[PDB]
């Protein structure tokens, strides 16, 4: 909770941070998709790598 900036400034700051969350979300989705697409392959080929605890084969 921290003063200094004008209402105008705090307001474009809010816009800039919204756009930044949008970019982070997109990145989270990209990461998620990559994980899922890689897991399909891991699952069909060497599912044992998904074991807990991990026994190297």
């Amino acid at each position: 909770g921290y003063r200094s900036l004008t209402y105008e400034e705090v307001l474009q700051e809010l816009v800039k941070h919204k756009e930044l969350l949008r970019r982070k979300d997109t990145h989270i989705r990209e990461l998620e998709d990559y994980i899922d697409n890689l897991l399909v392959r891991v699952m069909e080929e060497t599912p044992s790598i998904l074991r807990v605890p991990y026994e190297p084969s």
Binding site: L39, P47, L50, R51
Partner: protein, 168 residues
């Protein structure tokens, strides 16, 4: 170390209901209060005596945030049981039960043994889902039913025991 049957079982249910702690409690006797949303897909195995037989239970877990995704087929592939879990203290997780049911009908084998599990029974003061209401729903839908607490362990063994014996 040998065994008479290997059974693939999957955990499904809303994020936060305690799927991963039912897993760690069953397979490792461990519980974690500071438990993060499951990333990816994993499994852990445990052997138990059910009747005369030793059964390798191969228990699979993943995030329940999403319904259908690229890992979905592979996840249900070969699964002979599902534990379908809600949180007794969050009515929403219980509303979502039929949504998860459709998801099983759509992707699991038609003969999957499904058990309905109301988890977090330690939260008796915070209960949002009466046992009877869920009990009613389960029998109506051909499902075994049980309430557990991964936190204090109540019924966790019984739950896995029951589904595994009903797979036989």
């Amino acid at each position: 170390d040998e065994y008479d049957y290997l059974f693939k079982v999957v955990l499904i249910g809303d994020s936060g209901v305690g799927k991963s702690n039912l897993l760690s409690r069953f397979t490792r006797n461990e519980f974690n209060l500071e438990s993060k949303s499951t990333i990816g897909v994993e499994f852990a195995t445990r052997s138990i005596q059910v009747d005369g037989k030793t059964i390798k239970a191969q228990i699979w877990d993943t995030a329940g945030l999403e319904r259908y995704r690229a890992i979905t087929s592979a996840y249900y592939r070969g699964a002979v049981g599902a534990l379908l879990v809600y949180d007794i203290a969050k009515h929403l997780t219980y509303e979502n039960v039929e949504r998860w049911l459709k998801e099983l009908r759509d992707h699991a084998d038609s003969n999957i043994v499904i058990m309905l599990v109301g988890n977090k029974s330690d939260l008796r003061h915070l209960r949002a889902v009466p046992t009877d209401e869920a009990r009613a729903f389960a029998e109506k839908n051909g499902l075994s039913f049980i309430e557990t607490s991964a936190l204090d362990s109540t019924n966790v063994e019984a739950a896995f025991q029951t589904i595994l014996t009903e797979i036989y």
